[PDB]
Amino acid sequence: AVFYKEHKLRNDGLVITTNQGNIRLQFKSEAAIEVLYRADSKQLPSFALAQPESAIKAQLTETENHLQFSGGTLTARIQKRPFAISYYRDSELLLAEESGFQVKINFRFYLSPGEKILGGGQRILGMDRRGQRFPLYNRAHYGYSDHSGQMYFGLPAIMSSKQYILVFDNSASGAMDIGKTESDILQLEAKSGRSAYILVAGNSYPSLIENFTQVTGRQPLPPRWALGSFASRFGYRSEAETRATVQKYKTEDFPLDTIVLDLYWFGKDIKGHMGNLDWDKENFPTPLDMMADFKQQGVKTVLITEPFVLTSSKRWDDAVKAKALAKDPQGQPKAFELYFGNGGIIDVFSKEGSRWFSSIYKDLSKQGVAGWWGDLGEPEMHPEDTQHAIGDADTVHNAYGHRWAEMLYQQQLDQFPELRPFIMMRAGFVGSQRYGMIPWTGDVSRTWGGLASQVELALQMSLLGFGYIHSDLGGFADGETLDKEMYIRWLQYGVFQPVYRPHGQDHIPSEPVFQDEETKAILRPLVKLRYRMLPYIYTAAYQNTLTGMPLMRPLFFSDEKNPALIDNKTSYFWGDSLLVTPITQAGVESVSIPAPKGVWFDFWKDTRYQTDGAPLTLPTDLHTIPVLVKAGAFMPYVPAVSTTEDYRSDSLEIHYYADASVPLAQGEIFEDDGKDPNSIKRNQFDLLTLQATHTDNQLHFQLARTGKGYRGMPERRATTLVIHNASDQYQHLDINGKTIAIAQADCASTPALACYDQERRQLQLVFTWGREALNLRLHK
Ligand SMILES: O=S1(=O)N[C@@H]2[C@H](O)[C@@H](O)[C@H](O)[C@@H](CO)[C@@H]2O1
Ligand SMILES: O=C([O-])C(=O)[O-]
Structure with a gap:
């Protein structure tokens, strides 16, 4: 039994008093609101919000039974008695509280009939998670296949077919009930932590995601090398083995940007060395020479790191001395059994923990490490009596990984302000993308069911802020012999998802260079294709940094008024133009x-x-x-390179898919130096735009470049434009008003500037694309 008592306005924030206490309402944008219950009391801060302390001017109007608090898109309607907040995009009801907030922390809301609900982050339950209940407690699911209620990276968030996103801005052990218990109730619970939710509205799924990333964080453009080929396994045992793998990519003619070193870089065994955070010199004798030798071949080195310092590790005593580890309530270092041994957890929520850990990352980066793998950040084992500077394990659990990313991101930016950090991690929180987090779906089984779940996982994470969600290509867990067909299908799919990183337990090779002739003859041209496609993928990356638009988009984006499409997890968009x-x-x-x-x-x-x-x-x-x-697609290619360090767009090949059904089409290619974290903000880029106008008698292309450019940007690109399904009735090309005849023979066999291949219905135009506007006009 709850009722309105009064309200103030303080710094554009509405402070409501009920019988039970205070509620603080702040618009974070015109389409996003933070609702803090128990506002009177000291709580954990927001983790989800990029700007926690922001509140924009809203308008407040007061009636007899209700208040109205509006931002411009999003309207909070506050019913006084009984107390209930509902949420309107204009006059369309998105979401209404039932009992709302209670006591343990509890939030209750009505679900509309037929409303479909994506969310929860990683689960294998079906795209619409309505009719499911599951914990909010990041935890390993080793060897998962076709089902999971609880995995590495949960998100306390949902996306509705009503086009809102709801965030439970709470880090604690908790649960989500999506009208399972009560068919028309959505319930959010936590054991403790912050009593706050965030509602975000949009006119469409893309503008919803733009609005969401606006207030939770935009992923900074990763280094272009994150779009390349990774050599990874669990694990290279030695410097010799690591050098032999880089060499195998060279001798087998597969592209390679990055080799990843698993836990043998810091010890000879799986167990008992974790926390060493330094080279096993018996097996990695000359690591500086090793990384420098790789850098000469355009290959980056990434090292695994973990939260746990074992009591058996060389750094236990020093970590205890520095007060870097989380404590028991008695105030000693907390030690507990992991799979790896007995140890503590570095306290990334503490000054001492952050400085100690940061120092080690700084030292290893100076030696030549290009990027970082932070594993087990659930944290994998987190006993409930572990104490962090700001809360107990069960209170901070789901934000540990989030803060670890923040610590490592800030550290890499302070050491290398002119480079983009690469941070791959297993667990985070809503907003972790703002620290450049690149998540992977953990220890997937080497089974078809493991592969068949990845699109579902990727879309669920992409929809809620994580564009670079990917899988261990080929599968990770167990098996005794390679399932060749599954492996091949997995590495084909890999070309069309965010991060090309095959990885698995090393009794079966994860790297394509170690496969049989048939397998290599299939995958080699597809891994080259991935590199030839860098202008397509890197442009989707750019759009992700700009608007949160994920690289993988669900089938349901194609028709927002057909909710039955929401259930699809077998077909998805890779960028704007490819249905995979x-x-x-x-x-x-x-x-x-x-x-x-x-x-x-x-x-x-x-x-x-x-x-x-x-x-x-x-x-x-x-x-x-x-x-x-x-x-109407424009598909851009550059020549294949072995490493993105050699990337050039001096030579472009663009394939335009012509059809009279698409009278207007636009494409863009985002080019920068592939490494400057300030390129977008400072406009140090070359943004190529293409517009096609397709009428009954003409096909007109308008080409243009904007941005201030960048060092090494080509002034003039040799461009081959291939027009698919081109009319056989085009006589004449004008390039900037100069008329050129279209050849109709020997297109593949002359240095033809315009040639129609009648057998393939392809019209090829070859020209110079310089800094000035270019118009190409085909006419019958
Ligand atoms: O529990 S594990 O076997 N799974 C963890 C990661 O998810 C893997 O990617 C990684 O290769 C393993 C070795 O560092 C980790 O140990
Ligand atoms: O597409 C066209 O215009 C044609 O086929 O001639």
Whole structure:
């Protein structure tokens, strides 16, 4: 039984008093509101908000039974008696409190009938998590396959078919009930922590995600090398083995940007060395020479690190002396049993912990380490009586990884202000993307079910802020012999998801260079394709940094008024133009692709398909996976390089997918030096735009470049433009008003500037794209 008593306005923030206490309402933007219950009392700070202490001017109007607090898009309607807040985008009801807040911490809201609810971060439950209840407690799920209620990286957040996102801004051991217990109730619980939620509205899924990333954090553009080929396993045992792997990528002609060193870099055994955080010199005798030798070949070194310092490690005594470890209530260092041994957890919430850990990262980065892998940040084992500077284990648990990322991100920016940190981690919180967190889906089984779950996991994490969510390609856990077909399908899918990092337990090779001739002959041209496609992928990365638009988009983005599409987890968009359907079972001979209505081309074969709603049936082969290109797409390629350190766009090849059904189409290619963290803010980039205008008698391309450029930017790019499904009735090309004849023979066999291949329905234009505007006009 709860009721309104009065309200003030203080710094654009509404402070409401009920019978039970104070509620602080602050607009973080015009479409996002923070609702802090128990506002009177000392709580943990926000973790989800990029700017916790922000509140923009809202308007307040007062009636007899209700207040109205509006930002411009988002309206909080406060019913006085009984006390209940609901949320409106204009006059459309998004979300209404039931009993709202109670006591342990509890929040209760109504679900509308037919409302579909994405969220919870990593679960394998189905895209619509409505009818599910699960804990908010980051925890390992070793060897998962086709089902999980609880994994490495949960998020206390949901996305509704009503186009809101709700964040439970609380770090503690908790739970989410998505109308499981009570078919029309959503309930958020925690054992402790902050009594706060955040509602975000949008007019569309893309503007919802832009609004969400606006207030929770935009991922800084990663270094372009994060889009490259990683050599990884658990684990290279020696410097000799690591050098032999880099050498194997060279001799097998696979692209390689980065080699990842697992826990053998700091000890000879899995158990008992964790916390050493320094080279095992018996097995890595000349690590500085090793990293420098790799850097000469354009190869970066990434080292694993973990929160745990074992009592058996060389750094136990020094960590205890520095007060770097979390304490028991008696005030000693807390020691407990991990799989790896007996040890403590570095307290990243403490000054002493942060400074001690930071110092070690700084020392190893100076030796040549380019990037960082932070594993076990759930934290994997976190006994409930462990004490951090700001709270107990159960209170801070789901933010440990978040703060570890912040600490490491701030540290890397202070050491290398002109470089973009690479931080790969297993667990974080809402907003962790603002610290450049790159998550992976942990210890997936080497099974088809493990592969078949990855699109679901990726989309659930992408939708709520994590564009660079990826899997251990080929699978991680157990198996005794390679499942070749599964491995091949997994590394094909890998080309079309965020981070190309095969990784697995080393009794079976994870790296493609160690596979049989057939496997290499399939994957080598696809790993080259990934590099040739860097202008496509890096542009999707740029859009992610700008608007939070994830690199992987769900099928349901294609039709926002068809909620039945929300359940789809077998087909997704890789950037704007590619609809990818991974093969996630053995011997699949054909697939049914629920392609949105319109025109689509086979990415591999150029075949044109039209549909008015009916799915498309494509045959499958071992050498590819089904990929359709949207009519009106501009697909940009550069020549393949071994390493992004050698990346050049001196030579562009752009494939435009023409169809009269798309009278207007736009593309963009974002180019910068691939390394400057300030390139976007300081406009030190080359943004290429392409516009196609397709009428009955003409096809007109407008090309332009904006931005201030960057050092090494080519003034003039040799451009081959390949027009797919081109009309056979084009006679004449104008380039900037100068008329050129279109050749109709020997296109592949002359230095033709415009040539039509009648057999392939491809019109090839070869020209110079310099700094000035270029118009290409084809006419019948
Ligand atoms: O519990 S594990 O076996 N799984 C953890 C990570 O998830 C793996 O990626 C990594 O290779 C392992 C070795 O450092 C870690 O130990
Ligand atoms: O697309 C066209 O305009 C054609 O086919 O001639």
